[PDB]
Protein backbone atom coordinates (compact mmCIF):
# COMPACT_ATOMS: atom_id res chain seq x y z
CA UNK A 1 0.00 0.00 0.00
CA UNK A 2 1.21 3.58 -0.84
CA UNK A 3 3.31 5.74 1.46
CA UNK A 4 3.40 9.52 1.38
CA UNK A 5 5.60 11.10 -1.26
CA UNK A 6 9.27 11.28 -0.33
CA UNK A 7 12.38 12.79 -2.00
CA UNK A 8 13.59 10.76 -4.96
CA UNK A 9 10.13 9.58 -5.96
CA UNK A 10 9.47 9.79 -9.73
CA UNK A 11 6.19 11.31 -10.97
CA UNK A 12 4.41 13.03 -13.75
CA UNK A 13 3.58 16.47 -12.32
CA UNK A 14 0.68 18.59 -13.62
CA UNK A 15 0.86 22.40 -14.04
CA UNK A 16 -1.93 24.52 -15.57
CA UNK A 17 -1.38 24.86 -19.31
CA UNK A 18 1.14 22.06 -19.53
CA UNK A 19 0.89 18.29 -20.18
CA UNK A 20 1.61 15.93 -17.28
CA UNK A 21 5.38 16.38 -17.06
CA UNK A 22 8.17 13.90 -16.07
CA UNK A 23 9.48 15.05 -12.69
CA UNK A 24 10.88 14.04 -9.30
CA UNK A 25 10.34 14.97 -5.69
CA UNK A 26 13.50 16.87 -4.80
CA UNK A 27 15.33 17.08 -1.48
CA UNK A 28 15.67 20.53 0.06
CA UNK A 29 19.35 21.45 0.46
CA UNK A 30 20.72 22.78 3.73
CA UNK A 31 20.14 26.54 3.65
CA UNK A 32 17.74 26.41 0.70
CA UNK A 33 14.22 27.88 0.72
CA UNK A 34 11.59 25.48 2.14
CA UNK A 35 8.32 24.80 0.26
CA UNK A 36 5.01 26.09 1.66
CA UNK A 37 3.12 23.73 4.04
CA UNK A 38 1.69 20.60 2.36
CA UNK A 39 3.75 21.34 -0.79
CA UNK A 40 6.69 19.39 -2.23
CA UNK A 41 9.60 20.73 -4.27
CA UNK A 42 9.14 19.28 -7.75
CA UNK A 43 12.09 19.14 -10.14
CA UNK A 44 10.91 18.98 -13.75
CA UNK A 45 13.07 16.88 -16.05
CA UNK A 46 14.18 18.36 -19.38
CA UNK A 47 13.35 21.99 -18.40
CA UNK A 48 15.19 21.59 -15.06
CA UNK A 49 12.70 24.02 -13.46
CA UNK A 50 11.39 23.72 -9.89
CA UNK A 51 7.85 24.38 -8.68
CA UNK A 52 5.97 23.60 -5.48
CA UNK A 53 3.08 21.21 -5.85
CA UNK A 54 0.69 19.26 -3.69
CA UNK A 55 -0.25 15.53 -4.15
CA UNK A 56 -3.33 16.35 -6.22
CA UNK A 57 -0.96 17.24 -9.10
CA UNK A 58 1.52 14.32 -8.57
CA UNK A 59 1.03 11.03 -10.45
CA UNK A 60 3.43 8.14 -9.61
CA UNK A 61 5.59 7.47 -12.69
CA UNK A 62 5.36 3.64 -12.86
CA UNK A 63 1.51 3.66 -12.77
CA UNK A 64 1.19 6.62 -15.19
CA UNK A 65 3.91 6.23 -17.83
CA UNK A 66 1.83 4.27 -20.34
CA UNK A 67 -0.58 7.23 -20.41
CA UNK A 68 1.73 10.20 -20.03
CA UNK A 69 5.19 9.07 -21.20
CA UNK A 70 4.82 9.70 -24.94
CA UNK A 71 6.68 12.37 -26.94
CA UNK A 72 5.34 15.91 -26.85
CA UNK A 73 6.11 18.99 -28.93
CA UNK A 74 6.63 21.02 -25.75
CA UNK A 75 10.08 22.48 -25.07
CA UNK A 76 12.19 20.19 -22.95
CA UNK A 77 9.62 17.40 -22.75
CA UNK A 78 11.43 14.72 -24.77
CA UNK A 79 14.74 15.46 -22.99
CA UNK A 80 12.68 15.07 -19.84
CA UNK A 81 11.45 11.59 -20.85
CA UNK A 82 15.06 10.50 -21.44
CA UNK A 83 16.17 11.78 -18.05
CA UNK A 84 13.41 10.15 -16.00
CA UNK A 85 14.02 6.77 -17.74
CA UNK A 86 17.83 6.88 -17.98
CA UNK A 87 19.24 8.92 -15.04
CA UNK A 88 16.39 10.19 -12.85
CA UNK A 89 18.57 10.66 -9.74
CA UNK A 90 21.45 12.61 -11.30
CA UNK A 91 22.56 16.10 -10.57
CA UNK A 92 21.17 18.42 -13.25
CA UNK A 93 22.62 21.57 -11.71
In CATH, what number is assigned to the domain containing residue 58? 2.30.30.140
Answer yes or no: is 42 within a domain: yes
The Cα–Cα gap between 20 and 70 comes to 10
Distances (CA, A) of 56 to 8, 31, 90, 91, 92: 18, 27, 26, 26, 26
Determine, yes or no, domain membership for 23: yes
Rounded Cα distance, 25 and 10, in Å: 7
Pairing mode, if any, of strands 50-53 and 10-13?
A: unpaired
Q: Is the dihedral of CA 3, 6, 12, 15 positive or negative?
A: positive
Residue 93 falls inside a structural domain: no
- Give how many domains the chain has, as a whole number: 1
- Strand order of the β-sheet with 21-25 is 50-53, 40-44, 21-25, 10-13, 58-60
In-domain check, residue 91: no
Residue 21 lies in a domain: yes
Structure method = X-ray
| E strand or H helix that includes residue 61 | helix 61-68
Q: Give residue 67's domain range.
A: 10-29+36-86
Q: Is residue 1 part of a domain?
A: no
How many degrees, rounded to 5, is the angle at CA 46 between CA 48 and CA 85? 120
Amino acid sequence: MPHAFKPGDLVFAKMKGYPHWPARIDDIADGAVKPPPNKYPIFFFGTHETAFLGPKDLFPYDKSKDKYGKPNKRKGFNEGLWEIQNNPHASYS
